[PDB]
Design a protein around this ligand. Structure first.
Ligand SMILES: Nc1ncnc2c1ncn2[C@@H]1O[C@H](COP(=O)(O)OP(=O)(O)NP(=O)(O)O)[C@@H](O)[C@H]1O
Ligand SMILES: [Mg+2]
Length: 408
RNA sequence: UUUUUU
């Protein structure tokens, strides 16, 4: 019985909430034209409606004409958290595949295991009205009898495994790729992200390959780099005022230590478990420590980090997906792209700093973006442990120019 | 520091 128990206020939100948003010009879900006015193929329109999609979001309306335009043109595009970019590029991929040809024509790169899995599902479900459309997972969990070529028309994978499939394993002839999609593009091409493997895969593609880059964020230099690595691109860039959702409200709690952050969250756990929530940490060790501390305080809790094996990672993410786990202590491995409808609270138990210790503005926006997705109303609570930490948050605040409330 | 290949 407290203010943050007003998660329950969002537990059962309004009758035509999303529809009203898709009629507001100031909404990034805004729709001035129907799906049939985008002139998608019939099987791809059936796939769309089959998912319960009613109206295209801003990014979908604007990107698909640019991506389906003939002859093909590359695209570097930005749209906010939970605005439907996956459906945007999946429709792009499916729209250029010729199912008769039993080899990889369309390749998609995600930064992490779980995002590949998640996106793979959307691809299968979106193209389901092509009986012969098949999807191959170039992900860590997977191993095929060596010496073969995969006969699936669409590959989704993570940078390393795809690189091996396209090189020493010879599973995919990369020269036959028509559409190349980099999801969460900005981290896929940034030096501290997957630049090396990403570019080394790109180099293996044919000259006539359409290239599509999507993300909610494009750091200043990354935007300039993407322009030089992607030939002749159409560009969708946001103004920075547009980058934060009105639908995700941002808080912070002031503390003096890690023990004090543990106690706060302890007191708030009853509220967090009403629906579902995510807690981010700066490192794997703190993730694991937090998990053991919550668990020893008697709270059921889920852990997910990169040191876990894929079997365990796949296990947890599915359990969380089904609401069998209600809280997931995690690292930046889940900062991006993950889409779980019920996650109504995101907690930065550690504030997102970069390698050097600088405020990670991009990661912050992706992290808080795991709540309040496609029109749902969400909540992001920041745990501040020091004065230095308070500064990090204040610099983020005026990066985005979006003030963050204090919580008692 | 977080990810990312057999
Ligand atoms: N036109 C639509 N109508 C209703 N729901 C949609 C529509 N388009 C997409 N969605 C759903 O809303 C969610 C959109 O998030 P998704 O597209 O997965 O991530 P994203 O928009 O790329 N943002 P990010 O968090 O930066 O990856 C998904 O669960 C989609 O199934
Ligand atoms: Mg996405």
């Amino acid at each position: 019985s407290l203010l943050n128990k007003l998660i329950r206020s969002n537990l059962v939100d309004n009758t035509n909430q999303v529809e009203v948003l898709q009629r507001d010009p100031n909404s990034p879900l805004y729709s001035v034209k129907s799906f049939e006015e985008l002139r998608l193929k019939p099987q791809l329109l059936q796939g769309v409606y089959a998912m319960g999609f009613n109206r295209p979001s801003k990014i979908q309306e604007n990107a698909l004409p640019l991506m389906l335009a003939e002859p093909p043109q590359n695209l570097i595009a930005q749209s906010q958290s939970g605005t439907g970019k996956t459906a945007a590029f999946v429709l792009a991929m499916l729209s250029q595949v010729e199912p008769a040809n039993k080899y990889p024509q369309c390749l998609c790169l995600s930064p992490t295991y779980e995002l590949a899995l998640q996106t793979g599902k959307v691809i299968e479900q979106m193209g389901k009205f092509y009986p012969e459309l098949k999807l191959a997972y170039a992900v860590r969990g997977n191993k095929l009898e060596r010496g073969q070529k995969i006969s699936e028309q669409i590959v989704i994978g993570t940078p390393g495994t795809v690189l091996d499939w396209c090189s020493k394993l010879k599973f995919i002839d990369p020269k036959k790729i028509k559409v190349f999609v980099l999801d969460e593009a900005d981290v896929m091409i940034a030096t501290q992200g997957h630049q090396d493997q990403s570019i080394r895969i790109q180099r293996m593609l044919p000259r006539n390959c359409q290239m599509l880059l999507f993300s909610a964020t494009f750091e200043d230099s990354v935007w300039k780099f993407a322009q030089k690595v992607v030939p002749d691109p159409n560009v969708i860039k946001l103004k920075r005022e547009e980058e934060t959702l009105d639908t995700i409200k941002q808080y912070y709690v002031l503390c003096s230590s890690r023990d004090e952050k543990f106690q706060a969250l302890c007191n708030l756990y009853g509220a967090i478990t009403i629906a579902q929530a995510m807690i981010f940490c700066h490192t794997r060790k703190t993730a694991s420590w937090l998990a053991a501390e919550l668990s020893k305080e008697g709270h059921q809790v889920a852990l997910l980090s990169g040191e876990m094996m894929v079997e365990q990672r796949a296990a947890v993410i599915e359990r969380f997906r089904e609401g069998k786990e209600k809280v997931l202590v995690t690292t930046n491995v889940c900062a991006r792209g993950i889409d779980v409808e019920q996650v109504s609270v995101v907690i930065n138990f550690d504030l997102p700093v970069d390698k050097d210790g600088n405020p990670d503005n991009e990661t912050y926006l992706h992290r808080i973006g795991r709540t309040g997705r496609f029109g749902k109303r969400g909540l992001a609570v920041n745990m501040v442990d020091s004065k230095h930490s308070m500064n990090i948050l204040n610099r983020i605040q005026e990066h985005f120019n979006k003030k963050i409330e204090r919580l008692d």
